[PDB]
Amino acid sequence: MREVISIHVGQGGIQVGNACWELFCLEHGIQPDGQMPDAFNTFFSETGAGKHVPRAVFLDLEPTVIDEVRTGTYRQLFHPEQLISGKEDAANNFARGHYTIGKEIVDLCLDRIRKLADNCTGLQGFLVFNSVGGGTGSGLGSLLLERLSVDYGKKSKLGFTIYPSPQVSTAVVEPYNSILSTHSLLEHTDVAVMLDNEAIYDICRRNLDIERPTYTNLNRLIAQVISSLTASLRFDGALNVDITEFQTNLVPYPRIHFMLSSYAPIISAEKAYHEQLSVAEITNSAFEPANMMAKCDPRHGKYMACSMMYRGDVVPKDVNASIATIKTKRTIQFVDWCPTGFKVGINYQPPTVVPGGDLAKVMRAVCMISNSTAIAEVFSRLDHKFDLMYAKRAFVHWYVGEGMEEGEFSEAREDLAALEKDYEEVGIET
Amino acid sequence: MREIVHIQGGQCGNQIGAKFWEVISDEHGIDPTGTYHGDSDLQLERINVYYNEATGGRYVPRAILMDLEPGTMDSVRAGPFGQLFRPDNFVFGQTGAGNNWAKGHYTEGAELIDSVLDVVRKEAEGCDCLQGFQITHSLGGGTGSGMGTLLISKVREEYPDRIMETFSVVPSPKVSDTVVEPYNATLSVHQLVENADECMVIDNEALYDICFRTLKLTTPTYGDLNHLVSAAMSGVTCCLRFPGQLNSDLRKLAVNLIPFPRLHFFMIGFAPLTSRGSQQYRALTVPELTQQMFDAKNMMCAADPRHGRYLTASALFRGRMSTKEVDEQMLNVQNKNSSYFVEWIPNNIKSSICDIPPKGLKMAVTFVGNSTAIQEMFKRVAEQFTAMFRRKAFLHWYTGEGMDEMEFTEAESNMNDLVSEYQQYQDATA
Amino acid sequence: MREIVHIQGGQCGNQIGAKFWEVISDEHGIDPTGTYHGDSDLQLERINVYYNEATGGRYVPRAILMDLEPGTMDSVRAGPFGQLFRPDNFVFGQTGAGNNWAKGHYTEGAELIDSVLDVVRKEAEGCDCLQGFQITHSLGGGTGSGMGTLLISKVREEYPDRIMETFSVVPSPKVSDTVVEPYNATLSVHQLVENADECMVIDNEALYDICFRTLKLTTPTYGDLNHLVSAAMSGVTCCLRFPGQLNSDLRKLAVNLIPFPRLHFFMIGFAPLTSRGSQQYRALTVPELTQQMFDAKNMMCAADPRHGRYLTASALFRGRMSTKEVDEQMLNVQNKNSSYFVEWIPNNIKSSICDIPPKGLKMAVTFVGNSTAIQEMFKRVAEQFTAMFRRKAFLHWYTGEGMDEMEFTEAESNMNDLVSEYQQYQDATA
Amino acid sequence: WKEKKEVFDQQKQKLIEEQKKIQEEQLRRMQEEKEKKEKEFQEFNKKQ
Numbered sequence A: 001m002r003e004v005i006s007i008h009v010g011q012g013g014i015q016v017g018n019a020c021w022e023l024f025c026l027e028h029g030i031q032p033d034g035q036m037p038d039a040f041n042t043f044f045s046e047t048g049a050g051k052h053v054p055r056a057v058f059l060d061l062e063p064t065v066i067d068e069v070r071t072g073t074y075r076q077l078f079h080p081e082q083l084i085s086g087k088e089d090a091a092n093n094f095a096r097g098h099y100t101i102g103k104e105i106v107d108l109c110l111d112r113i114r115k116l117a118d119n120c121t122g123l124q125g126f127l128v129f130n131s132v133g134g135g136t137g138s139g140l141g142s143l144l145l146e147r148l149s150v151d152y153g154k155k156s157k158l159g160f161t162i163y164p165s166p167q168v169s170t171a172v173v174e175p176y177n178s179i180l181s182t183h184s185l186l187e188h189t190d191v192a193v194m195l196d197n198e199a200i201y202d203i204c205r206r207n208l209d210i211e212r213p214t215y216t217n218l219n220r221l222i223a224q225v226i227s228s229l230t231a232s233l234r235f236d237g238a239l240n241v242d243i244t245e246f247q248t249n250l251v252p253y254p255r256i257h258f259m260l261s262s263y264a265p266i267i268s269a270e271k272a273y274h275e276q277l278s279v280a281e282i283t284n285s286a287f288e289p290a291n292m293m294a295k296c297d298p299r300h301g302k303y304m305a306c307s308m309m310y311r312g313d314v315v316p317k318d319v320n321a322s323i324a325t326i327k328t329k330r331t332i333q334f335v336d337w338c339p340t341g342f343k344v345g346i347n348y349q350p351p352t353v354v355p356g357g358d359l360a361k362v363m364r365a366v367c368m369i370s371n372s373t374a375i376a377e378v379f380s381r382l383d384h385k386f387d388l389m390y391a392k393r394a395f396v397h398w399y400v401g402e403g404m405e406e407g408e409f410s411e412a413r414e415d416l417a418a419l420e421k422d423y424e425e426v427g428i429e430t
Numbered sequence B, C: 001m002r003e004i005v006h007i008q009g010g011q012c013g014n015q016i017g018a019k020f021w022e023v024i025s026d027e028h029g030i031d032p033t034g035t036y037h038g039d040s041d042l043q044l045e046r047i048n049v050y051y052n053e054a055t056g057g058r059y060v061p062r063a064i065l066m067d068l069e070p071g072t073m074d075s076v077r078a079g080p081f082g083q084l085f086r087p088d089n090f091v092f093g094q095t096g097a098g099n100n101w102a103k104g105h106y107t108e109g110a111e112l113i114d115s116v117l118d119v120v121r122k123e124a125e126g127c128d129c130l131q132g133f134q135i136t137h138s139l140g141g142g143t144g145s146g147m148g149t150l151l152i153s154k155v156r157e158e159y160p161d162r163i164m165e166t167f168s169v170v171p172s173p174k175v176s177d178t179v180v181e182p183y184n185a186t187l188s189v190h191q192l193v194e195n196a197d198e199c200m201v202i203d204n205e206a207l208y209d210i211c212f213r214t215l216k217l218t219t220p221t222y223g224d225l226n227h228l229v230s231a232a233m234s235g236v237t238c239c240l241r242f243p244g245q246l247n248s249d250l251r252k253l254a255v256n257l258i259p260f261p262r263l264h265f266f267m268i269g270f271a272p273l274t275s276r277g278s279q280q281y282r283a284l285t286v287p288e289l290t291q292q293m294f295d296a297k298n299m300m301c302a303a304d305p306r307h308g309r310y311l312t313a314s315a316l317f318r319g320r321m322s323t324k325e326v327d328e329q330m331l332n333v334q335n336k337n338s339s340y341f342v343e344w345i346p347n348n349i350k351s352s353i354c355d356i357p358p359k360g361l362k363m364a365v366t367f368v369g370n371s372t373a374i375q376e377m378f379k380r381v382a383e384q385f386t387a388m389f390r391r392k393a394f395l396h397w398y399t400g401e402g403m404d405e406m407e408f409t410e411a412e413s414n415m416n417d418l419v420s421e422y423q424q425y426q427d428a429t430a
Numbered sequence D: 001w002k003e004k005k006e007v008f009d010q011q012k013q014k015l016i017e018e019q020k021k022i023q024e025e026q027l028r029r030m031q032e033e034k035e036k037k038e039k040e041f042q043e044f045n046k047k048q
């Protein structure tokens, strides 16, 4: 009687949704056709006899990815008319997907959301995935969040956004729409998790020893993180954690809800079994700055609160004995007004392996969600990138001619300045 | 006659009860199907204390299970001895509290509590002669620490002359699993002192310390901590269910261990406890039991009892033994430690003997002592509370559901006043 | 001796009777072929109450079935126990009323009623000593609420000293299946108060609430509501067909439950009612029966009985039990709830004991209480009536068959006067 | 300094409390009456 609905918008969102939906189907024993040859209820729904239907909706204005989905092996799984598709792409223009073509599509998505919600009885909250540096992704994510915040109100929404890397970039105009989308979801999303690609590339290179990774390898790690986060809702555990038990433990103030994640262990089968993978060493590896899932240095800032999930055969006393060691270290310092900052969850189900993938099978794993003061650097560098081109009003004509006003750029800049001032104000000791 | 009903709330309380009832059933020879298969006549004479009688000759506990989420009770039913509980007594909500005290005490816990109070009233009105209630809950969680404490006040308002027990687990700063523990601990201690006739604090840190040092087992789990807590719980009411040289119900302990109505926070301990490999070396004698009973590491709390002076003490011996030896040993443990006993109340140790030992053991002792050393726990809890509250961290979650900071200030002031007036008698001299 | 005849009208009444007669036949061991196959001697001693004797040794109910359309009686004949009914007693028209009260009471119901009155007179003149009549019909339909109530007046005019029962289903505003329900409900209540010696209101909404909450069965159907109504119907006349400690016919209840001739609208309830999975947990005792008997949710009406004060109450216990326990429990249920019992009539609860329990149950109770809380149903019915009548909506259908608005005004005024004078005694004090 | 800090804001909330208490005191003192209903009932009963 506990449910959650995941929203996938944009090319990156759909490509990570595919990645998480192989993993969930594999973890619950459901074949790609949707047929089994009481834990499924969190992500799926029973049709009365036979197949299961995911509680997910796919959105995009550009039809190529959806058409690829509707012809692959998973054509029989998803309901045919929840893969909403458009005709014309926003083409990396934020104003297009927020004012011009997204408005005519958003009504169908909201109707689908209502039709899925009326089925659930214990709706925990929503999940949303969107790559920020694109037109349709950021614009439609903003519009959907704004509609949901007023249609439903206090229901919790979680956002797994992928911000651009510090120096590596695929587009040339992504700072503009990244800043605008951050403006939009700052006052509209309860949790936002950092996911830039460069850090995960470094993780793959160093640990998985892959020298030529593709997007699928990144999306599989993200899917594993999602599964670790939501395992506690569908498996028995000695110390459970619910989604609603987050803003009471990781969010000191309503404005501050951007945090960065990490995962451990990450290791290949060729050298995994030569070492014992004790809980102490994995919880040490999880706190290593080089294993952050976002390219930010935690040594440059304080910690505010750490929520970290275990799964497997871990014993609570071993967890406490390792939290003490971390509190001992002099290179990790917490904020003054937080004496204890750890929330611990323990689950019994070990992580599942996907055949043909990178990760091996292990009995212990740890996933941490940590809120730290050091996150302000990404905001500062994105702001610096934005200012350089906004000084000469470059690329603005592509946005003014799509219905957006001239002054809309300035207030996003002011909100980022306010956020950066707030992060500095919080981190000073009393 | 003089029976009590069981009420438990939250996940921690449900897990404690899931072992407490197993221990009681094994003691009385009740199979997991509710059928008596015991050996001794005394096993059935006073079974009305905890068990009711139904048609078909089976027995059903008079326990009431409540939580704001259905998962824990849906899991405890599948465990051993899970079928004994009457399905009608299961009451649950569909939302949960998310470790937020305000949600579990003002908004959600207020509407649901009518249904559980209905079954509580049904159970109490029916029974032959009420002795009282015993409550198991945790102070580290939202729904538990809120709904349980509000239920305490509601029960006290309707049965002012009955006795009330509470076994409360307080969050230690060593093993912290939730970041918002100080808030709902401090808020709960405020209400708990006003209504509970007896309170018994239990700490996970002390349980891990005991398991690692005395039993010396490699991998402690929640099952061992629950088993120790269950043995301690059963030891208190043993003489009320079995004959003995000096019977002593709960009210007699209440008279003899509480000097002033606001000083009713005890810490307990169980003896004997020996490792598997050393269970053959030791010989069970009254001196061996009493030397381990007053041992500082044997207390179920991290509070150090030689950092203060005992106001009073109690011991509940089990098994057949001579009373002269018990009295002389109690005198000896009080003459050799005169510095740690307050001097203006002479003969401050109570003893009782029950002729029925635990199954598998020939002698056992349960210790309940009211000491001034408990101040250290409230001191550190208030220290963390005032470290976190001065910045108003995580305050918006509580203030968004009708609560204000004034109730936080009053709670802090009352808790500090309790801390001060509890140590006031430590320096008092005759 | 002192037997009664059965008369039913409309589709709802026919469906109620189709289960009432099945229940009676199963109680007396009569096969669907009319052949006795019972086990106990008492099953045949008082069979003349409901069944007649014909050649060949078979038994035939003295029931009269009437409707303005032939479909329902053509359908009830093919059901189980449908062959018992004498084909001669089936009277029907070829047109129907179409849920129009005027058509079923002035134009069509007036011409047909002579034939049914002929067979009614044949049945009553013949029987040994008449006790009275019992009527089952619905107030939400046209033909039923018209022809049944006119037949009530015609029967009362010819047998002024006999007793008359009516089991009336009134249209609740929650589950509404007909838009013209208020008109024919208000018109029928006007005539029903003037002639019926007893009236028992039953609501489909309360039956659904009971089925969903107490029995906890997933999919209620009309068969379950009919079964509950049939059990309640059979419980009233049980002691008139079986020996007991204190026999009490219908006239004795009429004397003791009606203080003033216009206050004869009761609401009933049946106990025990338990789910299939909990039928083994519960133990049948007099306290368990009496606590469920006075439960507010157990009433067969949505009216809330703790919103008013009982003028009087009645209970018809079944099975072999001690009278001292029954009397002391009745006293206890009246001392603990003195606020909900009117004070100027002391000892306002009647009890009766019958030694023959229902087949399959060891104890059963039928509750008939006259309470002031019934005013709420007439209040809402009149509210809907005056909301619809002020615009003269759907009035032309009624006014086209000789009826006028003056009879609507008089009916509304008389119903409001009944509502007022029924609550007049609620505020009365001694 | 820290123990010194422990006093002033709490004193100001109490003063605010005095005005609130004053209104309740007044409120309790306001009282009004219910005799009219009794007189009217006395009238209602007489008709009955």
Ligand SMILES: Nc1nc2c(ncn2[C@@H]2O[C@H](COP(=O)(O)OP(=O)(O)OP(=O)(O)O)[C@@H](O)[C@H]2O)c(=O)[nH]1
Pocket (backbone or CB within 6 Å): A009, A010, A011, A012, A013, A015, A016, A062, A089, A090, A091, A092, A093, A131, A132, A133, A134, A135, A136, A137, A138, A162, A164, A169, A170, A171, A174, A197, A215, A216, A218, A219
């Ligand atoms: N992690 C990850 N990021 C991706 C992936 N695909 C695209 N991105 C990121 O998404 C950004 C651009 O947005 P896209 O998702 O590609 O396109 P869009 O969101 O649909 O917006 P449009 O261009 O209007 O179609 C790029 O800067 C990429 O870094 C992916 O498969 N995995």
Ligand SMILES: Nc1nc2c(ncn2[C@@H]2O[C@H](COP(=O)(O)OP(=O)(O)O)[C@@H](O)[C@H]2O)c(=O)[nH]1
Pocket (backbone or CB within 6 Å): A238, A239, A240, B009, B010, B011, B012, B015, B016, B099, B138, B140, B141, B142, B143, B144, B145, B176, B177, B178, B204, B222, B223, B225, B226
């Ligand atoms: N002894 C024991 N303690 C437990 C168990 N499960 C959780 N706890 C403790 O309970 C605390 C969390 O309480 P929580 O589950 O949030 O209570 P709730 O909010 O009422 O559900 C943790 O600090 C644990 O130490 C258990 O099985 N046994």
Ligand SMILES: Nc1nc2c(ncn2[C@@H]2O[C@H](COP(=O)(O)OP(=O)(O)O)[C@@H](O)[C@H]2O)c(=O)[nH]1
Pocket (backbone or CB within 6 Å): C009, C010, C011, C012, C015, C016, C099, C138, C140, C141, C142, C143, C144, C145, C176, C177, C178, C204, C222, C223, C225, C226
């Ligand atoms: N208990 C019960 N109620 C019924 C059944 N069928 C219909 N009803 C109720 O009867 C009402 C309609 O009455 P109707 O059939 O028009 O009566 P008629 O005009 O005399 O035929 C509906 O509101 C239903 O709630 C049944 O099988 N059982």
Ligand SMILES: [Mg+2]
Pocket (backbone or CB within 6 Å): A010, A011, A062, A089, A136
């Ligand atoms: Mg695209």
